[PDB]
Amino acid sequence: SERIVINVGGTRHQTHRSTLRTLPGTRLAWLAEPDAHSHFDYDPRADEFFFDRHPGVFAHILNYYRTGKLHCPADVCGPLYEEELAFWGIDETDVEPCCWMTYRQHRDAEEALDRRWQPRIWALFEDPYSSRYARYVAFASLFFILVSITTFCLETHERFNPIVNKTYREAETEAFLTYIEGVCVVWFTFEFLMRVIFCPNKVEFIKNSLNIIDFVAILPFYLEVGLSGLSSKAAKDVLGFLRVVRFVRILRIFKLTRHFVGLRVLGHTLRASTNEFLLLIIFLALGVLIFATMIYYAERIGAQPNDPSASEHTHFKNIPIGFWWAVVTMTTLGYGDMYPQTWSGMLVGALCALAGVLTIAMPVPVIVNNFGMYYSLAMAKQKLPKKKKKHIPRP
Amino acid sequence: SERIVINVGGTRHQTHRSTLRTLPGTRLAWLAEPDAHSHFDYDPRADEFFFDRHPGVFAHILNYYRTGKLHCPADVCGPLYEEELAFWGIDETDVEPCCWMTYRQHRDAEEALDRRWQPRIWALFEDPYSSRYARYVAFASLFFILVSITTFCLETHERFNPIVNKTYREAETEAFLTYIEGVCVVWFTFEFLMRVIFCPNKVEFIKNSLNIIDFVAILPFYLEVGLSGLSSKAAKDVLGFLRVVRFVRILRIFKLTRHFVGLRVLGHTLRASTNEFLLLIIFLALGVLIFATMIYYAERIGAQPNDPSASEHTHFKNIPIGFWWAVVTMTTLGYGDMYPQTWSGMLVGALCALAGVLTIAMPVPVIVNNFGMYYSLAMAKQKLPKKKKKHIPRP
Amino acid sequence: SERIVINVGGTRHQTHRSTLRTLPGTRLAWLAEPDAHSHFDYDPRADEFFFDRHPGVFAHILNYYRTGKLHCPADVCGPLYEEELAFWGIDETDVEPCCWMTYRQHRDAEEALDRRWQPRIWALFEDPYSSRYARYVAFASLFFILVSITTFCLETHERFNPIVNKTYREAETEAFLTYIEGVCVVWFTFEFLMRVIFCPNKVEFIKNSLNIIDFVAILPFYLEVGLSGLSSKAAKDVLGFLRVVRFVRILRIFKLTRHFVGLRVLGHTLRASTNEFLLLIIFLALGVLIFATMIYYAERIGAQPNDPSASEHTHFKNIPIGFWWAVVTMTTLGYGDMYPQTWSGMLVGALCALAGVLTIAMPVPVIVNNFGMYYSLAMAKQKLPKKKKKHIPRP
Amino acid sequence: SERIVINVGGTRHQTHRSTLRTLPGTRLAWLAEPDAHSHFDYDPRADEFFFDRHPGVFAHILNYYRTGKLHCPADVCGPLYEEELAFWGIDETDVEPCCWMTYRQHRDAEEALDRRWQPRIWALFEDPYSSRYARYVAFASLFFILVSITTFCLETHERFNPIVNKTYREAETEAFLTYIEGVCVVWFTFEFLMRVIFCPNKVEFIKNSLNIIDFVAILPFYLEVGLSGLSSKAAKDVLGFLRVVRFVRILRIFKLTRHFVGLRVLGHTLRASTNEFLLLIIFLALGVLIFATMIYYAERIGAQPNDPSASEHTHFKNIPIGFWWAVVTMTTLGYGDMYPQTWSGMLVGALCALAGVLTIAMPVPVIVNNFGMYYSLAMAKQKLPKKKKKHIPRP
């Protein structure tokens, strides 16, 4: 008589058949049919149906059935409630906004985070420490990347570019640094040559950004060597262009840091928080423009309409330079190259400081907390090494 | 015999009729009446009343009945407990302070966040991307707003105001920038004219701050054009005033950013955190005044009562300038235009730095966390698109 | 037979009499006695004892009885668990460290936050807005405090102290500012005189820090007026001392801000977080000393043992000045008056920057979070105005 | 018939014997054996097994049995769930990543935080305040450490090193400071001598870093005294070396601060967050290198290939100095000694500022939150003094 008792894991839940039918197409709606006594596990003597599930969360699922809103309990995790909803046939997109984010947190974080000697030669990058030879190769690669970066940094130092007035007063970098860069080049191009020759999935290897970086890093030395024969003025200009391009040597440390879990988590966080990064950029641009205009106008209060001497006493000659001042003041960087010198400009700068603090504190915590989730999940996955399931599902 | 059993969703709750009557005027108080056996769903054989509700939270409601204090469970959400309290007749303002904020969080966040061709022409701003023509119009508006802002920023640059000594050594802005601003004006005033002519709810349209901004942005060009005919000295002064007013061009980017969810969430957060903003302002003012006075006095320790040379060795000539120093030091901005040069002033500046850090870290986290709630709720509402209810309430 | 059933709010809990006796002196230990059948509410037919309490938390209390450790459920609040423990006779100091802080949070926050016309005249400060006359008096007091502060700030400005060379080239402040300070004095001393004459609890009134501040603020004007008659050189020195003491005028704004809930919450937070403030001070001192010594030594690498020219190229002449540099660099203030100019000093300064960031981020979040608790509780108490209890305890 | 009822603390849990056998080797798997009726507490009349445990968490353990995933309820603490899992034979390493971190938090924090007169003389450092004589000794040690640090700081001040041109224009520190350092030395070496003579566990005492620091602090004075007799030029060089080593006096304040709970918690946090510190270091190095290169190239846009005058207008002569600029800009320190002066360098500096803010805000919150856990746990352990257990385990 409209009375149905559901025994979920030893706990008897009593509700109405109309309440069960309120959500058609689900297991509890099917149970509310006159044929459930034969279509389900039914007890004639006890006059109740049995279910080997978790009653505590069945209570909340039946609360959805009863009221019309699907919430999520805070005493169990999202994955557990998801398994129970899947078993009961409840659509997980019915979760109310008051619980959706907490319910999805873990799944969202997981989504964000996720010849016979030819294989041996291709194993040079895969777990280099696994083999002694590959570990030694990795150590040599670290040496020859650090040395290349050091040579690139030193080539710009004035000590290594004494001015030669014989050939014409121009500068000339020392040749020993070039020789060290050359030995770096020969070793690193040996590695690149073996990687390119012994290369499965050629399309993927070419598309690989790290390999592209390696190729564009090795190109300039060869191009400079070849073009030196031409020894033309246009060849000199192209040599200058090649020197400009030589900066790609610093990008070979991303290969070294590619195995770092913190770096991978940071990359995943950057991919996930694109909206927050765009929000930060837009906020910063708005504040920069507004405060540059405000300081420009506050530093000219009481000035003549067109007198050129109005701008002779203020660092803020124009609004574009106020942009730089505003970004520096908003980031609390405060270089001091430009600062207000009037009372009105002083008030404007104070407002700029507080506004920058607040507008940067708006989305940076969101990005930081996303990074926290992803880092914690990665560390947990490390601390939980793969092992036997220990559980046998039913035949 | 004073013993009453309430069967809430299959779970039997046993309490005393005096306990039920402790809260008069509620459903459980009515149940505690001699006529509940006919006024409610009663089972003579089982001698208990049945309720198709959530027992887990009925336990806490009955705990309110039993002890006298209404708390809120942490295993269910505020909206769920609110529905249950509403059904049971419990006043939601009885929630104790230890649980009120958590119970209300979601509702507070939601409150904070909340001719035949004439409609087609009025659809120019409503979902411009919806129609191809309106999307093109929006692209053109973006172009003509960015170009206007660029021209306004460039007019203040010294490169575009060569000094003319013929007519009288004064500055004169280039005319090509004025011409580009003029084409910007003609397009934007075409848009404004159509918006004003085809305008439902004229009162609302006039009261609209964005439309007011548009009108005050278009006024100065027309006023300068008209007043140039007068060519009087007072007309020149009014032209200078119009140049000052010309700054309202930068306010036309708020129209572009008005569709941004981050901007709307920021606005809602600013509306909600007025108390925290006032607290921040008052704290900053107190600290600024106190530390300006303290540094003024610390830089004059051991000085003569009236010797004018006492202030010749310190940046802190007066307390008003100490205000600027104190705000700069409190925000950790540290421009460096003024800094203590004595030991006592050094100690005072250190105290200013720490005090500013703490007093700014007091309410900024509150504002940030409010922003976090509102942003998370808005993102959840986006991720949860409107769909079928999927639930049928009882006839 | 060692089997006892406890019916707590309709839920039957079955345990052993030895388990109940494991904690002597409590209600459940008494229940485990052969005389509980007459000393408690017992049901012979059902063979169980009845209790009109919350079973969900009785389960955790019985878990304490069973295992030996008292924990606190996260599905209910600390006050609720406290009431239940008090009823069951459990000592609340048995709570394990894994739950003690969460259990106590709310109570700790509450502890931190906590003639016939003679009363009318004494009501001048109590809710001044309550009476129209008192509100007008408060407005006048605000006016005469702001004006006094403005006069005090302006007296130090060079515009108001033109140098008089007739009487002897010394400075002399303008007399109109003194006259305005005098009218401020007469009004404020009228208020102070009425407060002192009509004064209940004279001991408390004298001990009041705000009234002490008022008296020390009014003293210097009278002392300067009286001592001007002496017109002696020692009198001039005492006049200079009185000018130094005149700074106490800025302390009369604490009276205005004493009614501010944010200010009161800040005071409570300062009282509560004394340990964290001491930790911050000690950390800062350690880092300052260490980094001052480190930078002093890093700026003298390769220098002569005693050559005086070693310190001619570095801002770090000594360690005491390195203290100032270190505090400025640790607070991320970066004035720029002193900075490393060597590679070793540069590394030391970088280490100082990161170390300061971390050591300041250590306890500042603790203080901030305490402030957050207290502010949230105060706002909740405001949002929950006093009303009828609505609940009637049993006779 | 495949139906088994488990009565856990008065609550009847009904499941299948196959469900119980899904996890072999556990208590519930043993219960699912035909001999459980004699191997466990069984009730023939009621046909159920009894367990004096917590049903609420038994429900989640049986949910593990049922589904195959072990989660952890959020309504109870990690230690409680750990005791229950241990009783039921469940491996605590089966906890899913969605709950592992919350389940382990407390245990991880605890792991991170963890003659007859000869003993009396050795009690000089153990609870010095316990005995009056030891408290006086501690006060004297504080005096003689602070005075030594003050003398060390003052010896580098130019006031105490007047230049002597008689003996040869070199500097000479005052002798009274040396005499005060000598009395400091005699007292502190008395303490060290008694500590070394009366010393249990000599190996541990020698290995103690604080005692090593004490010995290396006392060595230089004796070495300078002894070597002064030689009075050789090489002896003068070794005297300069000893002056350099004299810096170890500042390390004697770690002994004073070794009893501070905040310092111990900081040390534990540093030990625990090694991964986060390495992440911070690697992030900072990557950003510093990248932004130094970027600013170097942005300040030379449009410059000649080799013209020496290209670097005459920019602070960024090389990339190594850009390293210093980049670290200063990333930490928001902003000294101002070097800043971009071009538009491209300005954009690069802005990007550096935001990138530094974000990359420093990534792991610093993790370290801060670890510190928060450890500090809260230490304060809780203090607030919970050792007392009687009050609970008697079963014979």
Ligand SMILES: CC(C)CCC[C@@H](C)[C@H]1CC[C@H]2[C@@H]3CC=C4C[C@@H](OC(=O)CCC(=O)O)CC[C@]4(C)[C@H]3CC[C@]12C
């Ligand atoms: C420091 C910088 C970031 C500027 C300061 C930020 C806020 C103080 C302002 C700047 C832009 C403002 C927004 C600009 C325009 C709009 C659209 C406005 O909606 C409309 O105008 C639609 C029509 C109407 O009903 O008026 C709602 C507020 C909002 C989001 C504003 C909220 C407040 C904002 C974020």
Ligand SMILES: CC(C)CCC[C@@H](C)[C@H]1CC[C@H]2[C@@H]3CC=C4C[C@@H](OC(=O)CCC(=O)O)CC[C@]4(C)[C@H]3CC[C@]12C
């Ligand atoms: C850096 C700036 C913000 C100043 C430093 C802030 C705090 C160290 C001080 C400044 C003002 C102080 C408040 C000024 C006056 C009062 C009113 C006082 O109450 C009374 O005086 C009422 C009568 C009495 O019982 O004395 C309680 C403390 C409180 C809030 C003080 C708490 C401590 C405060 C916040």
Ligand SMILES: CC(C)CCC[C@@H](C)[C@H]1CC[C@H]2[C@@H]3CC=C4C[C@@H](OC(=O)CCC(=O)O)CC[C@]4(C)[C@H]3CC[C@]12C
């Ligand atoms: C930037 C400033 C704050 C200095 C850097 C802080 C930490 C890197 C150091 C400085 C002082 C150190 C503490 C100084 C001395 C001790 C006592 C030491 O215990 C003993 O020496 C007792 C006897 C023994 O077993 O050795 C335990 C570590 C601890 C707290 C140290 C932990 C690491 C600390 C906090």
Ligand SMILES: CC(C)CCC[C@@H](C)[C@H]1CC[C@H]2[C@@H]3CC=C4C[C@@H](OC(=O)CCC(=O)O)CC[C@]4(C)[C@H]3CC[C@]12C
């Ligand atoms: C301001 C500094 C810290 C530089 C900016 C940081 C991020 C914008 C960049 C710098 C280094 C990047 C990482 C460098 C290389 C890799 C390895 C890459 O994996 C591979 O290349 C493996 C082969 C392939 O499938 O391509 C995955 C992304 C990741 C972690 C990158 C993610 C994005 C990172 C963190």
Ligand SMILES: CC[C@H]1NC(=O)N(c2ccc(Oc3cccc4c3C3(CC3)CO4)nc2)C1=O
């Ligand atoms: C060339 C004329 C020269 N003489 C003169 O008083 N002014 C002036 C006047 C008011 C004024 O308001 C201010 C003040 C601060 C910020 C600010 C404004 C704006 C222009 C209205 C918008 O942003 N600014 C400048 C001048 O610019």
Ligand SMILES: CC[C@H]1NC(=O)N(c2ccc(Oc3cccc4c3C3(CC3)CO4)nc2)C1=O
């Ligand atoms: C013109 C006389 C001149 N000669 C002289 O010693 N002083 C002096 C003395 C003490 C002194 O205390 C200090 C120090 C630091 C901060 C501070 C104070 C106040 C005045 C009491 C309040 O805020 N300040 C200054 C002077 O101002």
Ligand SMILES: CC[C@H]1NC(=O)N(c2ccc(Oc3cccc4c3C3(CC3)CO4)nc2)C1=O
């Ligand atoms: C007067 C002699 C002069 N010539 C010379 O090389 N030095 C020197 C040598 C090493 C040195 O180590 C450094 C470097 C950086 C920081 C630092 C140290 C300490 C002294 C060991 C402790 O803190 N410092 C200075 C000098 O001070």
Ligand SMILES: CC[C@H]1NC(=O)N(c2ccc(Oc3cccc4c3C3(CC3)CO4)nc2)C1=O
């Ligand atoms: C000596 C030649 C001189 N003349 C000239 O235009 N350039 C130049 C050109 C482009 C350029 O791109 C930039 C700009 C900003 C950052 C940046 C780059 C890199 C080199 C490509 C990598 O990091 N930088 C510099 C010069 O360095």
Ligand SMILES: [K+]
């Ligand atoms: K800063």
Ligand SMILES: [K+]
């Ligand atoms: K700064």
Ligand SMILES: [K+]
């Ligand atoms: K700075």
Ligand SMILES: [K+]
């Ligand atoms: K900061």
Ligand SMILES: [K+]
């Ligand atoms: K500076």
Ligand SMILES: [K+]
């Ligand atoms: K600076």
Ligand SMILES: [Zn+2]
């Ligand atoms: Zn919900």
Ligand SMILES: [Zn+2]
């Ligand atoms: Zn509560």
